[PDB]
Design a protein around this ligand. Structure first.
Ligand SMILES: COc1ccc(-c2ccc(C(=O)N[C@H](CO)C(C)(C)C)cc2C(=O)O)c(C(=O)Nc2ccc(C(=N)N)cc2)n1
Ligand SMILES: COc1ccc(-c2ccc(C(=O)N[C@H](CO)C(C)(C)C)cc2C(=O)O)c(C(=O)Nc2ccc(C(=N)N)cc2)n1
Ligand SMILES: [Ca+2]
Length: 223
């Protein structure tokens, strides 16, 4: 997260870190056994880390649970980036508590201009790299479809939206991928792609979760 702020420990209790001996992507807890992330974060050896603030220090509220299943959307396309969504099942159920809690799925899509909370442990600089110990947060609005398509001509599908700041300086970034965009208590987005980070006229692009609620529910019911 570039241009964000320190969230505060366990203030975003649905935020998970996907770990393979290091943090590589975010995710969002949606019930005690399932995490929503980005398809492009798929890999072997995933451990889900819940209850984290400082990802480099044991602080006492963590739960580390191996992924037993990783289910990428059936029509994910790694070229176009359409349908950049994956469901991860935990090998055993998390213990839900105040610091490890789920986020609601949308019942309807959010309007342009809706203010959302984006969070993660990704890079915090727009040039160069700095990776934070503690979770970072950014308030950012959803942009209009027209502004999004103007920013990325020919690239924006009905399963994507843009969010952020066209002046630059405030964006998600590498390592935030798979993590949440939460608006009025609903998981509306997944950190997906962009051009660099926090560049002028190049807002973040996010998977549009409201198109996937039936798929998510049916997938959880069958796996
Ligand atoms: C598929 O969609 C996107 C969208 C954006 C990026 C991206 C993000 C940040 C940056 C980047 O500029 N990140 C930091 C920001 O400070 C640097 C300091 C490393 C430049 C670069 C890229 C890129 O396009 O190469 C990427 C991206 O990083 N893709 C990528 C693909 C292949 C390799 C590899 N085999 N070496 C590495 C990286 N992918
Ligand atoms: C869509 O498919 C992919 C595939 C791979 C990447 C990617 C490439 C390199 C890396 C990366 O450089 N990872 C390092 C290790 O080299 C970390 C230390 C951040 C784990 C991260 C990512 C990522 O998924 O976030 C990314 C990727 O760069 N995504 C991304 C997400 C958001 C923005 C933005 N809002 N500005 C920019 C870029 N996207
Ligand atoms: Ca920790």
């Amino acid at each position: 997260i570039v241009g964000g702020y320190t969230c505060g420990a366990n203030t975003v209790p649905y935020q998970v870190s996907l770990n393979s001996g290091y943090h590589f992507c975010g995710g969002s807890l949606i019930n005690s056994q399932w995490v929503v992330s980005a398809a492009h974060c798929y890999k072997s050896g995933i451990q889900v880390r819940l209850g984290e603030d400082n990802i480099n220090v044991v602080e006492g509220n963590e739960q580390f649970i191996s992924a037993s299943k990783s289910i990428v959307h059936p029509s994910y396309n790694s070229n176009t980036l359409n349908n950049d969504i994956m469901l991860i099942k935990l090998k055993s159920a998390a213990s839900l508590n105040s610091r490890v809690a789920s986020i609601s799925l949308p019942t309807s899509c959010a309007s342009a201009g809706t203010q959302c909370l984006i969070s993660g442990w990704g890079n915090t600089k727009s040039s160069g790299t700095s990776y934070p110990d503690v979770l970072k947060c950014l308030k950012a609005p959803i942009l209009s479809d027209s502004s999004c398509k103007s920013a990325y001509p020919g690239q924006i599908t009905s399963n994507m939206f843009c969010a952020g700041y066209l002046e630059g300086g405030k964006d998600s970034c590498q390592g935030d991928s798979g993590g949440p965009v939460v608006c009025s208590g609903k998981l509306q987005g997944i950190v997906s792609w962009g051009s660099g980070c926090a560049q002028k006229n190049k807002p973040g692009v996010y998977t549009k979760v409201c198109n996937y609620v039936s798929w998510i529910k049916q997938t959880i019911a069958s796996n």
